[PDB]
Design brief:
The structure is a homodimer. Helix content of chain A is about 55%, strand content about 5%. By secondary structure, chain A is mostly helical. A three-stranded parallel β-sheet of chain A has the order 1-2-3. The radius of gyration of chain A is 15 Å and the shape is globular. The termini of chain A are far apart. The interface between A and B is large, with 37 and 37 residues. It is classed as biosynthetic protein.
């Protein structure tokens, strides 16, 4: 009924240079691997936009983990509706993708997980911001794909120079 | 100055079961391989949302072609701006992603390529709808990745059951 909603910061956080952010993202996917998670079309594109700027070798080791994860994990991939679009225009300065993401969380009253500091400071999202779970794991085949994909490193600069 | 804008129908059209649609999409990428093409974050996510619903084997043969194409071809991957968001709310029934796509093409007056029949019939997009080029090719390494990826087949049902 109340599906968890994340953005690119949670997914790409599994490969963040900061080990504390990587621990938080690993704790979320480890606790929601057999649950439901929602991702918008825009957030999915933001992830690939960051990866496709990397070298050929780094993409070849990361993408196997990403594709198998999206396949074996019930990640609901959808788009925003008209009620979210109308709310995103009436709110006052963030990117349109963030305006739609905030409007979607507030409209449908869904739990929201994110590392984006521009969204956590928002008082409107405080009733929906949920703390990341702690460490407590994927199947062995997905574990080997993850550790082989850790050669990819995501930083704060990847989200600043996106778009 | 005037970059070509496409959607998921043009990109995923290269693997469409209809051979006439596949010929049109192959003609576009063949003529724009060394040029500039724009894709929004949403349209990129729509492509992956269609692929991740396929089997593990079909994803493993398609994604090498998609990833190498995005890397070696200057595909501008961005998001919509506030001027596009305000216009998308004032227009009258399409999905929010299509409302933002139509608003972006009309706002910036960019050439638009698409197979979406719900957009081609729009009179507002007629000054910007451009006909697909004819057949006239990728490098050999990308050709082998494409023909190996043709095992993936996209149909009209993939876009109807998306989201």
């Amino acid at each position: 009924a109340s599906i968890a909603v994340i953005d690119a910061t949670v997914f790409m956080g599994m490969h963040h240079s900061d080990p504390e952010v990587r621990a938080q993202s690993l704790g979320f996917f480890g606790a929601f691997y057999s649950r439901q998670v929602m991702m918008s079309f825009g957030q999915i594109g933001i992830c690939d936009a960051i990866i496709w700027k990397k070298s050929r070798h780094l993409q070849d080791v990361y993408y196997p983990f990403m594709d198998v994860l999206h396949t074996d994990m019930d990640i609901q991939r959808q788009g925003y509706c008209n009620k979210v679009l109308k709310r995103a225009c009436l709110e006052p300065r963030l990117s349109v993708e963030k305006r739609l993401l905030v409007a979607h969380v507030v409209e449908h009253q869904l739990p929201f997980y994110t590392h984006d500091d521009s969204l956590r400071e928002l008082g409107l999202l405080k009733p929906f911001l949920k703390t990341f779970p702690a460490s407590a794991v994927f199947p062995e085949n997905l574990q080997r794909l993850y550790e082989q994909s850790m050669e990819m490193t995501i930083g704060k600069e990847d989200f600043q120079h996106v778009g």
